[PDB]
Ligand SMILES: C[C@@H](N)C(=O)N[C@H](CCC(=O)N[C@@H](CCC[C@@H](N)C(=O)O)C(=O)N[C@H](C)C(=O)O)C(=O)O
Ligand SMILES: C[C@@H](N)C(=O)N[C@H](CCC(=O)N[C@@H](CCC[C@@H](N)C(=O)O)C(=O)N[C@H](C)C(=O)O)C(=O)O
Ligand SMILES: [Zn+2]
């Protein structure tokens with residue numbers, strides 16, 4: 074009658090979707106109570122935490138409509154600073170330990186994977202998230218972050234239709250395509266960018282490129298992820314789908 | 317026997333904020349009825365539309381928790397693809413017309429600005445949006461987009477505390493520092509990046525850099541926005557505060 078702003082809400086647009094475009098997977102590197110302490114009072118956070126109990130409890134720590142602080146400096150498919158456009162999922166797991174013999178990793182329990190798969194399907198359906206956008210911290214921050222690490226069972230997620238994975242026989246077919254001929258470093262950089270990685274395009278194999286090759290290997294060829302180009306890695310860069 | 321994944325909600329994180337980090341201003345380039353139409357079923361959308369009536373009606377077309385399709389290819393402060401992390405506000409305004417004497421824009425009405433300022437204060441308070449992140453389409457897509465254009469009254473927003481603006485006397489302080497010496501093009505590029513613009517760092521004044529210099533000029537020095545470096549523009553790059 075009439076002061077205040079008083080919006081007109083009679084019209085709504087058909088052309089809109091979710092602010093959440095990506096799901097990022099992490100491990101905690103620590104025990105469950107400590108993990109909860111860090112994720113609730115320690116300047117980082119995530120939307121979901123998956124415990125190490127059986128069945129594996131799923132804790133909601135941040136509402137999906139809020140920005141949790143899990144991705145940091147990050148890029149996927151040209152999208153930077155992913156916190157604002159992602160859901161973060163943390164899994165209780167020791168990560169790695171450095172030993173005088175070398176760096177060791179700790180496996181994930183079957184109960185955690187059985188909690189994770191239905192959680193991911195639910196999130197992906199509600200937000201329209203495609204398999205190529207369900208990724209690891211290591212994919213979005215190569216070299217800087219190595220979670221969820223070489224023991225994370227990506228193939229179990231792929232079996233459930235949640236992440237890309239070579240179809241049966243494809244790795245062999247692409248290896249046959251290359252026919253012993255290792256592509257140059259620029260080609261590897263081009264392929265990695267196509268899959269979504271931030272990578273240099275200098276044609277030179279420096280640490281910043283090695284780290285990205287290594288992140289891709291840690292996910293798809295975890296037997297060796299030193300970032301050295303080889304035929305098997307080239308073949309995977311061709312065989313791994315982008316959908 | 318389940319209605320979805322079971323969640324434990326016993327705990328909540330102190331480390332979270334809004335997914336909305338930016339507000340982007342546009343004009344429609346068309347009249348009220350077609351603005352409403354296009355922004356509700358024409359393949360694009362925005363959260364708010366400000367009409368050209370008196371007083372000006374504000375329409376909410378997309379809920380703030382949803383992604384509207386207004387920014388397109390975009391970058392601010394290193395954040396790309398800004399739709400997911402922005403609120404878009406469109407203002408009914410014809411934009412510009414081309415004439416042999418040059419491009420001519422249409423002014424905004426008093427009623428529109430009087431509606432816009434309290435809307436911006438409300439959104440900024442609720443989402444914690446800082447003044448440096450209330451920007452124009454031209455800022456995030458320099459060259460490609462020129463809205464809200466040279467007639468948009470930025471200083472009025474600045475007087476309301478919504479956008480950065482030089483303190484009185486600071487432009488004069490900076491003009492004096494420069495002492496009649498025009499910094500080189502690379503210096504212009506470095507300053508523009510600091511302000512948040514996507515800009516080359518080549519030291520060369522080619523179209524891509526000129527378009528960015530011009531976007532900055534269009535906002536702070538709209539008398540001339542041809543993208544040519546000059547002492548006034550240098551002084552503004554120093555005098556306009558970060559944040
Ligand atoms: C979740 C946990 N395993 C983890 O520690 N992740 C961190 C996340 C850190 C993060 O996202 N931290 C937030 C707040 C940073 C606060 C302050 N240190 C700052 O730089 O402003 C952030 O990076 N937010 C930025 C600003 C953003 O998303 O835009 C990492 O990748 O490094
Ligand atoms: C709102 C209006 N002023 C406008 O025309 N803006 C457009 C951008 C529209 C926009 O953001 N458009 C979306 C894609 C919409 C998809 C639609 N074309 C369809 O599939 O039917 C986009 O760029 N989204 C990108 C991908 C993103 O934000 O990630 C511009 O800057 O050029
Ligand atoms: Zn992580």
Ligand SMILES: [Zn+2]
Pocket residue numbers: 341342343386453461463
């Ligand atoms: Zn626009």
